[PDB]
């Protein structure tokens, strides 16, 4: 057996599929977006989560084609249900570092946005703070074109890496996403009370939006709301879910 072969097989069989984790406002209300999370519906093993296959996919050279397939499926899934999404609804994708050195990303973003009415969604690209993009004239160009499309850049896993204020201006960052490890420490450890505050301060200084991830408890939610966190994501709000479940919930909220 070849793992690379098997990934190419899975991709050709459209086995990489999107799950959707909702984002809600800091002060509560109806959902304001989703993060798209890849899953592998494997014929024999069931639904495999991405920490089990994305690293291999990155090594193999297949992550870009896999991401493109995911963005195309999301357009197919949600592009015909714009009426269920309040204008400005965020749709976020995790982008691998290789994809950021490829001007093709601009075309993939354009294509996704074309599946919805103009300005109706906000496309967000999430770049992990753990792997800081090495800038070049290509990245300069790419991020300028993405910004001109109206795409937003989020830095996720935030607080776990070592980005600088200069890097945040360089890649035109719109949003920080606080890693779930910091949220998990609310009401338990002082140091991360300080780390979490320090991220909030950085975001107010640079006028960035903040999403807090891993929000599992009301304690956590209230703590984050009291510090002006814009958006919350976590099992308290909603686990990642298949399309049918997302549509069911959106219909309910559309109704209220
Ligand atoms: N226990 C707990 N977990 C929570 C909570 N809130 C969110 N999570 C989980 O944390 C992960 C959030 O995405 P991430 O930090 O980008 O971390 C992601 C991301 O780095 C990567 N990944 C997922 N989808 C893609 C993709 O489309 N492309 C690429 N390149 N990477 C992806 O896989 C990682 C893991 O994804 P998932 O397994 O879907 O796991 C998701 C989500 O289900 C919570 O309250 N409690
Ligand atoms: Mg994704
Ligand atoms: Mg993410
Ligand atoms: Mg994270």
Numbering used by the authors: 5 to 259, 261
What does the paper say about this structure?
DGC domains containing the signature GGDEF motif synthesise c-di-GMP from two GTP molecules while EAL1516 and HD-GYP171819 domain-containing PDEs are responsible for the hydrolysis of c-di-GMP to 5′-phosphoguanylyl-(3′-5′)-guanosine (pGpG). Hydrolysis of c-di-GMP by EAL domains has been shown to require the presence of divalent ions, either Mg2+ or Mn2+, with the most efficient reactions occurring at alkaline pH2933. Here we report as yet structurally uncharacterised EAL domains from the core genome of Pseudomonas aeruginosa, PA1727 (MucR) and PA3825.
We determined the PDE domain structures of MucREAL and PA3825EAL in complex with c-di-GMP/Mg2+. The structure of PA3825EAL in complex with c-di-GMP/Mg2+ shows a different dimer interface to MucR, named here as the “closed dimer”. The Mg2+ and Ca2+ complexes show metals in the catalytic centre, annotated as M1 and M2, coordinating the phosphate group of the scissile phosphodiester in c-di-GMP. In both cases, the metal is coordinated in an octahedral geometry by Glu39, Asn98, Asp130, Asp160, a non-bridging oxygen from the scissile phosphate (P1) of c-di-GMP and a putative in-line attacking water molecule. Significant differences are seen in the positioning of the Asp160 side chain between metal bound complexes, with the second oxygen of Asp160 contacting a peptide nitrogen atom with Mg2+ bound; while the Ca2+ bound complex shows Asp160 bridging between the M1 and M2 metals. The M2 metal shows octahedral coordination for Mg2+ but trigonal bipyramidal coordination geometry for Ca2+. Mg2+ is coordinated by Asp161, Asp183, a non-bridging phosphate (P1) oxygen and two waters. The β5-α5 loop of PA3825EAL, residues 160–170, undergo significant changes between Mg2+-c-di-GMP bound and metal-free-apo states. The β5-α5 loop moves towards the active site and contributes to the formation of metal binding sites via two highly conserved Asp residues (Asp160–161). The restructuring of the β5-α5 loop and the functional role in metal coordination is thus conserved across different dimer interfaces.
